Write a protein that binds this ligand. Structure first.
Ligand SMILES: [Cl-]
Ligand SMILES: [Cl-]
Ligand SMILES: [Cl-]
Length: 1450
């Protein structure tokens, strides 16, 4: 009993019309109404309509207000009881033959439903295909069916408002060139001869199947390069630069502005770089307190289009070993055993003989099985057990440093492609791994079916998994389109017949209901396009190939509440395989292109750039292929040049696109750079690099400049660093500078360092980073030169890198130099040690001589290190043999460094004298517990002095004690942070009305503008107060009391005092309130003081407390008018014990003082500031009451010291409050509106300065323990100064677990999801450390510092290539990972001695954090407690439960 639009397209052709396609079942008569959309403001209609399937009855009023009804036509059909689709004769409708975009709303004759089927369309046989560029836009007009009517004058380009900007004609048969805008919205065709709609708001055609990728530097090229992309905090960043034009040619000496960007996006430093001999060179030191993450240097050549140079800043350890994990290139069959070949070796040139390889084998689905087909999914999504942990790998490499990893197949009957991932960790003799990942593809057949939905993927919430996930969605009652391909691993589409295309409806709340079935035949290099009528709910489209291989994609049918993925539903055109005769072309050459389209079709063939086309027209394509000539022009001096083709053929006219990069990079512009270095060398000796630049036929290397660098391979392998190539930078394939738009897809068919200070001074890491960069040299007449780089005490591999340049000639080369001693003696130690820890250090002595060696190793420990044993080892080593000495050590108490020294004897050298060798290794030591923070804050009056309390810095060790002193002229409470808007609202009930106007009695537009708060004009605000008064007066009852809405309603006792307070204050602020109303109100307030017994508050939990709050408020309002009888006040005072808050007592106190009883008045006020805080009925809270008490004290100019105490308390309460009620923000605004009205100027004389300190804003000053213990500050100003003192450092001993506001707990799980037994921990084990943080109020700036036991090392997730994955190894704690994904995390840091997370937490949302760690150095370790604290409020702090010692076994 339904009828709806089947095509859901935006354009039906004027030729082969057949009207609008409609699918009906048992519906004989259909009433359709057509509406012509108003030409003006048409983009506003499209954005509101969003190309829907149906029209909502309420939302129809707004949408159809910009469209006029032209025809009301009913249509006669003949179905009695099949759901056949049919035509709609539109040719007889004369108003529809006119220009404009139409909307058809159909309904069953006498049916009334919530929504009726609706579609937006245009009747036209015109087919435009626009091309967008950075400045211009070239449109190509055509025609549907047999004919390519190219003439195009009719181009209506409308903006966001809905006004046409330009319209003209050009080129052979017809074409048009127009000015492009950044905020352009539409494009329309023809004045009277039909209309074609094309909008720029829709995503441009997806060219994902085409190689249109490259650098976006179409303008003057600036190649940013350096010796590495990975730095440690405290290192000097080296960056070089060469500026050239679009064709790599030299240009005049111009300055380039460079900015250093932090991971948070803030700039650190800005410089103006000037070139020296055509070379740019930027150097600056990273602070030791620098943030870890992806930093970058951004360059500005002058085009204001930034050039980026990314670099990691991490606590990395250079790799001392190389690990190669190799699978098979070709996918395995489901019957095949999975095998990985392992190769490990020390970079100093020796195999990893006997080294342990620990690892994980995982089974995962291989859905993105063909890289050549991006977006195409392969395999059954409904198939179970495709994600598993296969085995834990534990093996020893042979004498050659070789091994093999294998697992028998446990997926022999799979119909879906799978993958086996080996996450292998090759371990050092100390336990530190070198981790790598290898993947093995498994294919159920040689060719598989692949599915790509043509519809967008939007983020839809799923309450079955309680997590929002982006999934391909389509509107309910609309057809779902899909691209189906039968492809091999390489991407070539194979011919197949008998594909079981099945539309399955998944159970909502029995079994999966098979909705529709199909049979598909595919041709080679053909993309199948299937469309199925979809109803509602969960769906799955599965295609089965005759070889039994099954592939399926899940999709939801329903509503979209915006939240769309950036162009997820973009049109993908059919491919036109374009072939070229030569691999590279030049200005003197002539290109011969073969256009091999799927079928015949007219359109265009051209050469493009980012500034426009260069071969504007070519129109024909005939038979099966077309070889055409393109003469490459001499003025084309750029490498962003591409080729493009378009073909169309009617049956609907199927469109196909072809795109290909035109290579213009000549090989004669490349320098033949040769580097001659020795293959092997000794440490502490200088390395010599012999450079030789040349080129064939020419052989003239005129003034060649060479920049030589040498970096440790163990640094470069972490980020698989590629040697910077200047030829590929300036001449390599640049990105496609165009965007293609066409309508063939819509055609109808039918401070700094402060976080590290809170955690504690990190121990120093003494690792050696071997990096060298010599000055740029000049090569002589022959093109010869030499660079000598001094190499220190390094044992490993060194990568020699060189960059060469002239004006247009660029070269790059690399060579590997092994730096190794005759006998290598290397010590493996943890990253740091804590006080009271024991670590088994390992010393590897390797004989790299051809002769046997006899040595003595003498060991001693200095600093905060001591040897557990004696180790007076006698070492005898045969050629190429390595031994490992176990050196157990203990870390002494305190913060500092430790050292192990080795003096080796009997080193027999050939020819050379036998002399003693010396080696030193340092380790950083720190306490095994987090730092504590002491915080002080006070306002110093002029002349007055502040000194640090004697009991303050007593628990800190002076060595690590650091502090921060912030001085300012304004209080720490910033009202703009809590109040963004302050506007009058004179409507609603009695409470709402008074609450929307109370702040409006005191502020003004000038004050709000100075505060940075949005408000009303003074005129609007005053008019609103007057409206509110007149409304409130109508709620006054005959007894003078006030009701909630009407004068006849029940009396509201607290609100009567509230509204009376408002109305009396309104009078003092220049507003008129009738005298009779005030008198009646005051008479009623007097009844409250005299008669609390007649008060009916039945919902009150504490009736006496409620009655007391009413009387005290009534008392203050009458006393401010000198109308409160002292007898009544004294009798209310006798019941003071009834108060449940300080506010009623402070109000009563002010009343007693005002009316004459200063003794009882001062007693009440003093009692109020000691009394802590429908339910109570007073609409109150602690926050509100503290702000009202503050205004009361200020207003009555009493207890200024108590005012400063409440102001600091308020600042912390506002900070910790999720949302503020109207009365809280009102009270807070009124208490803090006068503090920013004072200047920020301040003066102070301090203990740490001989010169006076002055400023106009808050100026921080870092302090050391000498300064802090004698810290004294004096106010030398005429205004009060505000000081904040934060001191941090390790205590002398470990404190006990404590918590205030915040809560933290730590638990360690194994990768099996079970609790890990902290004794049964072995060197190499991966563990999941789980933190849970809770809070009794909002902590927007919580800093989680989890100091590690020295035996645990973090798996740095930022350096994915060199570490184990949290995602892959955390499958058994997916609940915890999902909880963590929901947390608001500012940043996460994987440091040497700690895990750090900056997070927001509150009472309704506990935070879950999970991190992956590895047990490395064997020993017995102290476990520091987990810590969490607020940066702004350091008193919001928690230390988790004390844990048992951590034992790491060998
Ligand atoms: Cl080991
Ligand atoms: Cl006030
Ligand atoms: Cl802060």
């Amino acid at each position: 009993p339904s009828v709806g639009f089947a095509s859901r397209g935006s354009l039906l052709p004027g030729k082969v019309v057949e009207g609008l396609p409609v699918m009906a079942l048992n519906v004989n008569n259909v009433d359709v109404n057509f509406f012509r959309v108003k030409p003006e403001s048409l983009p506003a209609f499209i954005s509101q309509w969003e190309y829907r399937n149906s029209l909502a009855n309420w939302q129809s009023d707004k949408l159809l207000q910009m469209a006029d009804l032209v025809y009301t036509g009913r249509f006669d059909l003949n179905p009695a009881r099949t759901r056949e689709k049919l035509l709609l004769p539109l040719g007889d409708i004369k108003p529809l033959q006119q220009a404009g975009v139409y909307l058809a709303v159909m309904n069953q004759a006498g049916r009334y439903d919530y929504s009726n089927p609706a579609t937006l369309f245009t009747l036209s046989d015109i087919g435009v295909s626009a091309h967008r560029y950075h400045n211009r836009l070239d449109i190509f007009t055509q025609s549907l069916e047999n004919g390519a009517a190219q003439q195009g004058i009719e181009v209506s380009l409308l903006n966001e408002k809905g006004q046409t900007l330009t319209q003209a004609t050009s080129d052979a048969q017809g074409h048009v060139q127009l000015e492009n805008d950044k905020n352009a919205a539409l494009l329309l065709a023809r004045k009277d001869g039909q209309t074609t709609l094309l909008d720029l708001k829709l995503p441009a055609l997806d060219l994902a199947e085409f190689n249109i990728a490259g650098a976006p530097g179409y303008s003057k090229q600036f190649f940013m390069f350096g010796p590495r992309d990975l730095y440690r905090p405290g290192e000097t960043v080296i960056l070089n630069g060469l500026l050239r034009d679009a064709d790599g040619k030299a240009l005049p000496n111009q300055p380039i502005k460079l900015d250093v960007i932090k991971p948070d996006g803030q700039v650190l430093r800005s410089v103006v770089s000037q070139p020296e001999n055509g070379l740019y060179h930027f150097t600056w030191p990273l602070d030791s307190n620098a943030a870890t993450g992806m930093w970058h240097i951004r360059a500005n050549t002058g085009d204001n289009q930034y050039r980026m140079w990314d670099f990691h800043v991490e606590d990395f350890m250079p790799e001392r070993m190389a690990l190669n994990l190799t699978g098979e290139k070709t996918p395995l069959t489901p019957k095949d055993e999975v095998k990985f070949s392992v190769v490990g070796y020390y970079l100093y040139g020796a195999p990893a003989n006997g080294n342990t390889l620990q690892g994980q084998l995982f089974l995962r689905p291989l859905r993105e099985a063909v890289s050549a087909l991006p977006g195409f999914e392969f395999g059954d999504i409904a198939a179970e057990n495709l994600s598993r942990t296969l085995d834990e790998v534990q093996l020893t490499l042979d004498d050659k440093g070789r091994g093999e990893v294998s697992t028998e197949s446990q997926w022999k009957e799979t119909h879906s492609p799978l993958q086996v991932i080996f996450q292998g960790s090759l371990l050092e003799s100390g336990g530190r791994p070198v981790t790598r990942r290898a993947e093995q593809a498994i294919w159920p057949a040689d060719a598989l079916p692949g599915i790509r939905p043509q519809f967008a993927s939007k983020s839809v919430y799923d309450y079955r998994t309680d997590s929002t996930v982006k999934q391909p969605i389509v509107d309910e009652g609309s057809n779902a389109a899909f691209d189906i391909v039968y492809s091999d691993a390489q991407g070539v589409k194979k011919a197949v017949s008998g594909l079981q295309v099945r539309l399955i409806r998944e159970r909502r709340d029995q079994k999966d209901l098979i909705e529709n079935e199909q049979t598909l035949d595919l041709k080679a290099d053909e993309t199948g396009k299937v469309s199925f009528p979809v109803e509602w709910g969960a769906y799955r489209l599965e295609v089965k190939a005759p070889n039994e291989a099954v592939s399926s994609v899940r999709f939801w049918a329903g509503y979209s509440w915006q939240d769309n993925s950036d162009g997820s539903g973009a049109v993908r055109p059919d491919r036109v395989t374009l072939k070229l005769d030569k691999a590279s072309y030049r200005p003197g050459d002539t290109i011969k292109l073969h256009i091999a389209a799927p079928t015949a079709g007219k359109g265009y063939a051209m050469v493009e750039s980012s500034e426009g086309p260069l071969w504007w027209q070519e129109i024909d394509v005939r038979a099966q292929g077309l070889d055409l000539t393109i003469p490459v022009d001499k003025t084309w001096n750029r490498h962003d040049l591409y080729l493009s083709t378009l073909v169309v053929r009617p049956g609907t006219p199927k469109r196909a696109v072809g795109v290909l990069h035109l290579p213009l990079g000549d090989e004669n512009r490349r320098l033949d750079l040769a580097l001659e270095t020795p293959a092997k060398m000794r440490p502490n000796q200088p390395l010599t690099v012999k450079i030789k630049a040349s080129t064939k036929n020419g052989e003239k290397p005129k003034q060649v400049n060479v920049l030589v660098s040498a970096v440790d391979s163990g640094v470069l392998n972490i980020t698989d660093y590629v040697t910077p190539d200047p030829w590929q930078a300036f001449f390599g394939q640049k990105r496609y500078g165009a965007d293609i738009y066409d309508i063939y897809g819509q055609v109808i068919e039918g401070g700094d360092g402060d976080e590290l200070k809170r955690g504690g001074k990190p121990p120093v890491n003494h690792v050696n980073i071997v990096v060298q960069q010599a000055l740029p040299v000049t090569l002589n007449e022959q093109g010869e030169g030499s660079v000598t780089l001094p190499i220190g005490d390094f044992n490993g591999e060194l990568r020699v890198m060189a960059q060469a340049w002239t004006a247009d000639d660029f070269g790059s080369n690399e060579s590997k130099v092994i730096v190794a001693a005759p006998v290598i003696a290397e010590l493996n130690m943890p990253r740091f040690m804590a006080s009271g820890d024991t670590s088994r250090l390992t010393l590897d002595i390797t004989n790299l001589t051809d002769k046997p060696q006899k040595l003595n190793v003498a060991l001693t420990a200095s600093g905060l290190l001591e040897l557990v044993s004696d180790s007076p080892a006698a070492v005898e080593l045969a050629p190429g043999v390595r031994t490992t000495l176990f050196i157990p050590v203990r870390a002494l108490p305190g913060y500092g460094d430790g050292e192990i020294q080795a003096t080796i004897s009997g080193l027999a050298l050939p020819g050379e004298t036998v002399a003693d060798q010396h080696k030193q290794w340092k380790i950083g030591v720190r306490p095994a517990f987090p730092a504590q923070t002491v915080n002080y804050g006070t306002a110093l009056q002029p002349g007055e002095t502040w000194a640090i309390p004697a009991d303050g810095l007593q628990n800190f060790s002076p060595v690590t004690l650091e502090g921060q002193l912030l001085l300012s002229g304004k209080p720490p409470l910033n009202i703009a942070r809590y109040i963004k808007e302050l506007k009058a609202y004179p409507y609603g009930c009695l409470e709402q009305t008074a609450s929307g106007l109370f702040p409006s009695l005191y502020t003004n537009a000038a004050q709000l503008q100075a505060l940075g708060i949005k408000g009303d004009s003074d005129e609007k605000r005053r008019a609103s107060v007057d409206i509110g008064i007149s409304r409130l007066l109508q709620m006054q009852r005959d007894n003078g009391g006030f009701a909630l809405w009407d004068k006849n309603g029940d009396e509201e006792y607290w609100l009567t005092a509230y509204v009376m307070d408002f109305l009396v204050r309104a009078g003092e602020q220049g507003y008129s309130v009738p005298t009779d109303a005030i008198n009646r109100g005051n008479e009623r307030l007097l009844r409250y003081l005299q008669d609390p017994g007649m008060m009916s508050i039945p919902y009150a939990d504490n009736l006496k407390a409620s009655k007391f709050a009413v009387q005290s408020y009534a008392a203050l309002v009458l006393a401010r008018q000198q109308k409160a009888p002292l007898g009544a006040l004294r009798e209310i005072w006798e019941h003071r014990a009834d108060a449940a808050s300080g506010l009623p007592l402070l109000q009563l106190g002010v009343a007693l003082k005002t009316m004459g009883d200063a003794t009882r008045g001062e007693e009440a006020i003093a009692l109020a500031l000691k009394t802590p805080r429908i339910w109570l009925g007073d609409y109150g809270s602690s926050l509100r009451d503290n702000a009202l008490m503050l205004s009361l004290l200020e207003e009555n100019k009493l207890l200024p010291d108590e005012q400063y105490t409440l102001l600091n308390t308020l600042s912390q309460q506002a900070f910790g409050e999720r949302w503020l009620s109207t009365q809280e923000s009102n009270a807070l605004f009124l208490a803090a509106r006068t503090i920013q009205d004072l200047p920020g100027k301040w003066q102070a004389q301090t203990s740490f300065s001989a010169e006076q300190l002055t400023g106009e804003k808050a100026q921080n000053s870092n302090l050391n323990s000498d300064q802090l213990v004698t810290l004294q500050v004096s106010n030398s100003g005429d205004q009060p100064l505000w000081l904040r003192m934060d001191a941090s450092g390790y205590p002398q001993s470990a404190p006990l677990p404590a918590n205030n506001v915040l809560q933290i707990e730590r638990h360690i799980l194994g990768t099996d999801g079970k609790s890990k037994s902290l004794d049964s921990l072995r060197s190499g084990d991966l563990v999941l450390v789980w933190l849970q943080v809770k809070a009794s109020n909002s902590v927007p700036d919580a800093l989680v510092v989890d100091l590690l036991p020295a035996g645990l090392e973090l798996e740095n997730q930022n350096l994915a290539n060199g570490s184990a994955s949290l995602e892959q190894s955390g499958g058994e704690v997916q609940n915890l990972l999902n909880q963590m994904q929901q947390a608001s995390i500012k940043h996460i840091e994987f440091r040497d001695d700690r895990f750090v997370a900056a997070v927001a937490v509150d009472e309704y949302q506990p935070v879950t954090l999970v991190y992956l760690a590895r047990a490395v150095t064997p020993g017995t370790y102290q476990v520091p407690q987990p810590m969490v604290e607020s940066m702004y409020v350091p008193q919001w702090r928690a230390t988790g439960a004390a844990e048992d010692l951590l034992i790491v076994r060998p």
